Design a protein around this ligand. Structure first.
Ligand SMILES: [Ca+2]
Ligand SMILES: [Cl-]
Ligand SMILES: [Cu+2]
Ligand SMILES: [Zn+2]
Length: 437
C-alpha cells in the first residue's frame, strides 16, 4: 500500500498538523488534521514543487511565504483552475476540496480524489500541500482567489529513505549515470548539451567533469565506467560512442556506420570484456572490443525483434555468467535475451512498456519505466529465459526516471525529465540514490 505524509508547518516553521495520503485504486484517500487556523473555509491545493520556502509569486512578481511551492500541480498543463470534480485535462490536478476550520481553529478533512495519485503521471510524491488564507471560488485563475499561503508541507513517501543530488543547470536533463567506485565519483551526462557532471557520492559536491559541445560530445545518453576508470558515453543522434580518460580528456570518438537516423542509446560492458551498444532507431546491436574496434555485431532484421515507432531497444545488461545479453524494447515493453555465443534471440517477458535503463544484480533486474515514473523490479529464472514483475517503486517521486547505476549497496537513478526537453522542466534537475528493494 503506497502512502505519504506531509508535516504541515506555519510561516515560522512550527509543525501545526499533518496530511496523510493513502493509495486506494488510482486515486488517493486524503486526511488533514491541522490546528491554529482561523475559522472558516480555506483554499487547499497540491502544488507542483516539494519546497515550503519563500519564492516568487507570479501574480505580483515578488517573493512570498511558501512561494517556492510553485503553482498548483497541473499534470495535463491545463493552466486552468477549477473544481475538485473537474477532469485533469480541463483543470489543475492539484485542485482539492477546501479545508473547513471550526471555531476552535482546528481543520479536519477526509476525502478521496482521483485527480491525484502516489504513482505515475498524476503522482504527488515530493510535491506539496498548501493551505491558504481565503476561500477558493473554484473558478478564478490561477488559484480561485485563495490568496496568501498560510501553511505548507512537503509530501514525503512513508517508509523510505532516499538521497537527492541536485544539478546546477536550467536544462541539464541528466540521462546516463555511472559510478567509479575507486574514486567515489558519480558521473551523469546531459542529454541536451553533452556536459558530464561529476558528483562526489559522499559529500554531494557537483563539478563539471567535461563541458559538452565538441565533436562526438554534443549529447550524452547512457554512461558506463570501465575497470580503467574511463567513461563511455552513448552519443544519441550523433551516432557515436565516446570515451573520456579519468582526467576528463576525450580519448576517442567512435563512429557507427553513417546509415540514416542513428540513435545510440545505452551500453554495457559484458564479462567477456566487450561493450555492447543499443540503437533505439536502427535495428542493430554494436560491439566495441577491447581494441576499441566498433562493429555491427548483430543485425536484428532477421531476429524476432521488430522495430516500430518510438524508442526500440534501449536499456541493456550482461549476465554475470557471461552467457547472455538482456535488452529492453521500450515501445513494445518486451525484454529480450541474446545468446552471446550464437546470437540467438529469445523473448523473456513483456509488461515493461516505457522500460528504459537496466541494472542487473544476479537474477534481479531493475528497470526504470520513464513515463510510468517508477523503477520496476523483475525476478529472472536461472537460465534468464523467463521473469516475473515483483514490484514497481515510485520511490519518493521520479520525474521521468531514465537510467540506473550501482553505488555501493545503493542504486542511483536519473530524473531525466526527457518528456520536457524543449519545454518547461522542474528545477533543480536531480539524481536519486536509494537502497536496492
Ligand atoms: Ca535510454
Ligand atoms: Cl490567489
Ligand atoms: Cu494552493
Ligand atoms: Zn488550481
Amino acid at each position: 500500500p503506497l502512502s505519504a505524509t506531509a508535516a504541515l508547518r506555519d510561516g515560522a516553521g512550527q509543525v501545526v498538523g499533518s496530511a496523510r495520503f493513502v493509495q486506494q485504486g488510482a486515486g488517493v484517500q486524503v486526511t488533514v488534521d491541522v490546528r491554529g487556523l482561523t475559522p472558516g473555509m480555506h483554499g487547499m491545493h497540491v502544488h507542483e514543487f516539494g519546497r515550503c520556502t519563500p519564492g516568487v509569486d507570479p501574480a505580483v512578481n515578488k517573493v512570498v511565504p511558501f512561494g517556492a511551492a510553485g503553482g498548483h500541480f497541473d499534470p495535463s498543463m491545463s493552466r486552468n483552475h477549477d473544481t475538485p470534480q473537474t477532469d485533469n485535462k480541463h483543470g489543475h490536478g492539484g485542485d482539492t476540496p477546501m479545508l473547513s476550520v471550526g471555531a476552535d481553529g482546528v481543520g479536519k478533512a477526509s476525502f478521496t480524489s482521483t485527480k491525484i495519485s502516489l504513482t505515475g503521471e498524476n503522482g504527488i510524491l515530493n510535491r506539496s500541500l498548501v493551505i491558504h488564507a481565503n476561500p477558493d471560488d473554484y473558478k478564478t485563475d490561477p488559484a480561485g482567489m485563495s490568496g496568501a499561503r498560510e501553511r505548507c508541507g512537503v509530501i514525503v513517501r512513508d517508509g523510505l529513505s532516499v538521497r537527492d543530488y541536485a544539478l546546477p543547470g536550467p536544462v541539464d536533463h541528466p540521462e546516463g549515470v555511472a559510478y567509479d567506485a575507486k574514486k567515489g565519483l558519480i558521473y551523469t551526462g546531459s542529454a541536451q548539451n553533452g556536459t558530464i557532471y561529476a558528483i562526489n557520492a559522499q559529500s554531494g559536491a557537483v563539478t563539471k567533469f567535461q563541458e559538452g559541445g565538441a565533436y562526438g560530445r554534443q549529447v550524452a545518453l547512457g554512461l558506463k565506467v570501465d575497470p580503467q576508470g574511463r567513461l563511455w558515453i552513448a552519443g544519441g543522434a550523433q551516432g557515436t560512442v565516446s570515451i573520456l580518460t579519468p582526467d576528463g580528456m576525450t580519448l576517442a570518438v567512435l563512429e557507427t556506420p553513417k546509415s540514416p537516423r542513428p540513435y545510440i542509446n545505452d551500453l554495457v560492458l559484458a564479462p567477456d570484456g566487450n561493450f555492447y551498444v543499443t540503437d533505439s532507431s536502427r535495428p542493430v546491436i554494436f560491439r566495441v572490443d577491447k581494441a576499441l574496434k566498433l562493429t555491427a555485431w548483430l543485425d536484428l532484421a532477421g531476429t524476432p525483434i521488430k522495430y516500430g515507432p518510438g524508442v526500440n531497444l534501449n536499456g541493456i545488461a550482461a549476465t554475470p555468467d557471461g552467457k547472455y545479453l538482456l535488452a529492453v524494447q521500450l515501445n513494445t515493453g518486451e525484454l529480450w535475451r541474446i545468446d552471446l555465443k550464437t546470437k540467438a534471440v529469445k523473448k523473456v517477458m513483456d509488461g515493461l512498456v516505457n522500460g528504459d535503463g537496466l541494472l542487473l544484480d544476479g537474477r534481479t533486474l531493475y528497470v526504470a519505466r520513464n513515463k510510468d515514473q517508477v523503477v520496476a523490479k523483475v525476478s529472472l529464472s536461472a537460465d534468464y529465459g523467463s521473469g516475473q514483475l515483483v514490484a514497481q517503486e515510485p520511490l519518493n517521486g521520479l520525474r521521468f526516471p531514465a537510467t540506473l547505476a550501482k553505488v555501493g549497496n545503493d542504486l542511483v537513478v536519473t530524473q531525466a525529465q526527457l518528456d520536457r526537453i524543449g519545454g518547461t522542466p522542474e528545477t533543480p534537475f536531480k539524481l536519486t540514490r536509494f537502497a536496492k528493494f
